Design a protein around this ligand. Structure first.
Ligand SMILES: c1csc(-c2ncc[nH]2)c1
Length: 281
């Protein structure tokens, strides 16, 4: 059981060592499409690339590339698209991906500005009456409503395909209080946020996969998917303590490199799953 494993690694301060074993054990697959010179300006970070085997393809004949990975967790019956925070030139591609994958929710775990730099383009409208048009992908986006709380904001958005005049409602879940450095002290507001995404229906098999991002789509985004998948597997298995976080993380790393960036994010993931297990047992 992980509670005991937590105390061990914590009391022995072995987090950096566990983290290094995960780094060593992690899969490495080709990412040839990401490294094509024509895709250089579609990537926020040159060292963060989707693997070719799990990458999301855009349905445009010209250039199908977006920095986005499908993470398929077979036993948990959960899928997630993990992506980078859009660039000024990829906002249209981002919403094209949301449209084409039939996603119901977008989960954002960063602020647009952190540490005095832009971590993400402003890719949604700030006011009801000022809609955004993406001329390159023929999509219109309208803010319908915005519910601002202490730790997170939920926004209802209408996405309209200008080519076919279909419209869908998208929910934008924006966790606004992840600190500039380190991890939250307590996982309580993160768990509350995760239960709110679940309650929306956004993670349900009726819909396309949820889109999850931070700046690179590997660190905070990683913590989100890992916590969700681990808690769901604890519901599903005869023996909930058979759930090994490290194994789940390694299975997720077959689909996108670098998920969980620091030993602190790993410790936080254990804490989130341990605490979430109380609200689930
Ligand atoms: C790194 C690759 S592209 C890029 C960019 N595009 C627009 C703003 N920053 C930064």
């Amino acid at each position: 059981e992980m509670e005991k494993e937590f105390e061990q690694i914590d009391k022995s301060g072995s987090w950096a060592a566990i983290y290094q074993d995960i780094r060593h054990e992690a899969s490495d697959f080709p990412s040839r499409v990401a490294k094509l010179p024509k895709n250089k300006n579609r990537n926020r970070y040159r060292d963060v690339s989707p693997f070719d085997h799990s990458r999301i393809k855009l349905h445009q004949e010209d250039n199908d590339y977006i920095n986005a990975s499908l993470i398929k967790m077979e036993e948990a019956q959960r899928s997630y698209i993990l992506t980078q925070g859009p660039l000024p030139n990829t906002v249209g591609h981002f919403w094209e991906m949301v449209w084409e994958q039939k996603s119901r929710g977008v989960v954002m775990l960063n602020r647009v500005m952190e540490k005095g730099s832009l971590k993400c383009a402003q890719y949604w409208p700030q006011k009801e009456e000022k809609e955004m048009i993406f001329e390159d992908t023929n999509l219109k986006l309208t803010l319908i409503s915005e519910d601002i709380k202490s730790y997170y904001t939920v926004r209802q958005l209408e996405l309209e395909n200008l080519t076919t005049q279909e419209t869908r409602e998208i929910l934008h879940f924006h966790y606004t209080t992840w600190p500039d450095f380190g991890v939250p002290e307590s996982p309580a507001s993160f768990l509350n946020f995760l239960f709110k995404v679940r309650e929306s229906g956004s993670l349900s098999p009726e819909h396309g996969p949820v889109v999850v991002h931070c700046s690179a789509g590997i660190g905070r985004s990683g913590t989100f998917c890992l916590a969700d998948t681990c808690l769901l597997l604890m519901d599903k298995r005869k023996d909930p303590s058979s759930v090994d976080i490290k194994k789940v993380l390694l299975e997720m790393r077959k689909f996108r490199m670098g998920l969980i960036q620091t030993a602190d994010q790993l410790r936080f993931s254990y804490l989130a799953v341990i605490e979430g297990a109380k609200f689930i047992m």
